[PDB]
Amino acid sequence: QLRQEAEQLKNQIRDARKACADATLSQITNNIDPVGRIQMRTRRTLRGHLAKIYAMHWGTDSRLLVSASQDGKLIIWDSYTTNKVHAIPLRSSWVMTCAYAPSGNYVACGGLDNICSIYNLKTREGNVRVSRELAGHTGYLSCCRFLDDNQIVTSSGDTTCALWDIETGQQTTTFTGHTGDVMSLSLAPDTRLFVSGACDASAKLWDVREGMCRQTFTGHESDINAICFFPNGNAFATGSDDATCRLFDLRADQELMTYSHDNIICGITSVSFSKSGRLLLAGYDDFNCNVWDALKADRAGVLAGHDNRVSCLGVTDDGMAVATGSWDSFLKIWN
Amino acid sequence: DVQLVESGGGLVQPGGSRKLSCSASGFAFSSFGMHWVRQAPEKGLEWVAYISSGSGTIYYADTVKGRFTISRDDPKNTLFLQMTSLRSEDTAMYYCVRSIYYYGSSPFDFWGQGTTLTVSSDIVMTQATSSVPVTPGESVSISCRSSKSLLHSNGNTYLYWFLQRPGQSPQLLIYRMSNLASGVPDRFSGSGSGTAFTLTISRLEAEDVGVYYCMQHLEYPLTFGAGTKLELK
Amino acid sequence: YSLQVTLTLVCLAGLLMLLTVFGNVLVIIAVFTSRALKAPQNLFLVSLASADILVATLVIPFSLANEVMGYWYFGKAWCEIYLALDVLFCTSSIVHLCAISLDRYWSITQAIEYNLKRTPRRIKAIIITVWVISAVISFPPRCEINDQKWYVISSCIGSFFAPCLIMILVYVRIYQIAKRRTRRGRQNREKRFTFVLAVVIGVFVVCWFPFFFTYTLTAVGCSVPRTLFKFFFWFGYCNSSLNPVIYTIFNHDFRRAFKKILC
């Protein structure tokens, strides 16, 4: 007591979710035509880095992208022409994430040093400079996303997420419910809700203004390593070292479909959706990333390379292309 | 902050030799390409030379070749222009301009205060006429003309616009004939076809009276248009 | 003149051609396409493979054209450069192999100091040094190889004997050090490496030594040549085909690259 009250609450909430759903989602949507076999081809190969690369992010122009690698450098690429725009030397080489501001004026990186650095791209002196050193966290940084030109959300090893005010430099909100190291997060296109996955094998949606968890999703056997929203901001999918991918509905509070195959036994390092949401992409520990139809749940396609190991991938805003990175220090643009 | 100061000029008898220098402070000089631009005592602007960021690429104008040379010393933060066998018409006004070229850059953004000198095919840029009467608070348009179409296969139409208020150095207004420079009122707006170009001014005020120029950057040599000035009827 | 097996000889030569070129181009592709191979010492392999490609693609066809009917069909042009360029290519191969061995040795002993001086600049310096010493060897002065007694002895010795002796010394030293550091498992390797060290120093001798032995023979002392001279000449050509295999097979790293390229 009163620990039994909590399990009773879990019981009625689970039974209510079971009652509120019947589909299955086993025979539904069989009417719509399968998209068939999708072929992808490498179009460019960006080969500047000298060590494992750990994260990448697209700009809003859908032409520039930034990549972060363990050799302690940041690169801004011109994906159209494979030219390097800027090279940024990091203070601490143990970087684990990066993010591109929507306005295109700022870029952020962070990692195993517990602090998040903000870099200014448009200066009078024609060079990049540090603007802030957001240092409130205790565990290592895991992910960063720009809310706007002066608001950034972060996740760390403190089993918590934070919301900052870049000009002020003070944590203006905190989220403290995961009870386990959190690994990733993504922002809804509404730009008012976000979700985060943790090593506790559960996912929780947050309210930016309220600062309190609203819905908790579970039923996933191991760690969670990647999340991304549905294009309309009404769903999201999760990766894992469980070798299984799954998606949830916010208004239904249940799993909808699972993406697993017998041959694949390895973790999942990143996920992303297509512009229409028809194609789900995911990277794996077995050196190649598979492409999954959103709802028919089949491995529609696959991508050759890399040597090892697909650790980060993303899709442009216009959906024109897709990019992947890996521990072999190469980036490939697939179209 | 960012500022370029230059003084190496003076009265020189014809056929002499001279060196010009502008000192760079307040910005990463080693990462910029530099130009020299000459202005005749009456009017007009014409490009002279250019040295790349790493001093690995140099270009000259036609009359410049063989007599003038350009050099930089990045650790010392100085630009050098050497005069030899100066002619009679070389007497004019000079400027050194910074410029940096990457995707989405704004070259020719900042100009120096200039220094004066006294002594004793190509793309054609057309502006006409040289004067249009206006009043404060009403619209006005200026048009410039070229020979070849400026629209490259990329989709970038390389046209630039500059304004030089009397008694001071020119400054950048529009780059690639569709963008707007930093620290510029938004009333300015540039547009044009592949060979014909114009401007628009809304709510014109007494600060905007001066002379305007059009420049193209499609291919060396860089060529300027004529000068068109505004009056306050 | 044969008229009956000339087809057999030309087929043998073509097979040698394809084998050599395929092996060496595979080496070049593997070294440049694989990140793990981005080490300054592999430029030696690159240059050696390039020399092998050059000799195989152009020196050998003219040798086959010679003595297949018995007369150098072309005029004076171009015997006086065909011979010299053949000599240059083969000597460059030999000195590349010697330099590779010397680099190993300096790596395996006095590891730190040399570790320090392994910049790609020095590697390129050594490569151009090898090429220019080969050039100065081959520069002076019916088409048949040189016979000037004084010149022949000096080139043959300075092109084969010294590099062979250096190989013997350095690889014996290696073997000694590896055996000394040896003392499940460990005894299993001991048998493993010795074989793969005997291969390196074995193939090199059994191919270039016979010809170089007989070529300098009959040149100054007693002169008893035979028909086997063609066999020795051929063997000296042929070993360059296997030359990349010996230096690349013992590297999964290399090997892994080969497996990826193959499959």
Add this chain to the structure above:
Amino acid sequence: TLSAEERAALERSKAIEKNLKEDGISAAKDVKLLLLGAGESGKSTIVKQMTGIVETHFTFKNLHFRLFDVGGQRSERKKWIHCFEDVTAIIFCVALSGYDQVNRMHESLMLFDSICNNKFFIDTSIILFLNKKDLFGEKIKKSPLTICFPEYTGPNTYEDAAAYIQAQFESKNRSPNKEIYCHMTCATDTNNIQVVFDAVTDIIIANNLRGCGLY
């Protein structure tokens, strides 16, 4: 071909590439070491001998060392352990004396086994440090043996027990072609740098010999 602006941009990109490659070459010379202790082990003593990750770099006999000790990281090491996969060697320290505190030897041994058998990170030799000799010396001449290890079946003092626990650590090493260098530290010596240097040069020689190699 391509216009003047693109020519200048390509020149800038080539300059960036050259600078980056040169910086990488200059960086590849130094040697990287992971410091990985447990609790009250004398890792702090080793560091002093010389909130997140702490990098200490020093030079010894014209060789540059970079030593990382992830002590403040309280998160799960299964995540983020892969960062130090391309490292020359790891430095492990235990003690010897304390083994009745809960035990200490069992926890250190299981942690050592866990990091000695990893999916990646498997072919990196380990330098082992047994510090605080004098305390372990006194703990036996006063409170033998016990030992927390049963079936020890040996004498009382001293090299008997020392070598026994040492050999216990060199146990549980599945792989060949990977060595464990061990040492005894009195918490007052001044040549641990020398033994680290010797182990590092031995690892360098082993790696060199490794390609043809010709293990």
Add this chain to the structure above:
Amino acid sequence: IAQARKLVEQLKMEANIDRIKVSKAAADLMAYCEAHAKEDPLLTPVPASENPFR
């Protein structure tokens, strides 16, 4: 104690959600996907022209 009270207070908040029917939620997802299937190029390959990555 306080942690348990916090947890139960948090679980008080899950009672308000409606929820909606899974069948109609999946119908909404498939309807949106069908509506927007026209524009994404990775689904429907685009001509060799107008492709920035030739």
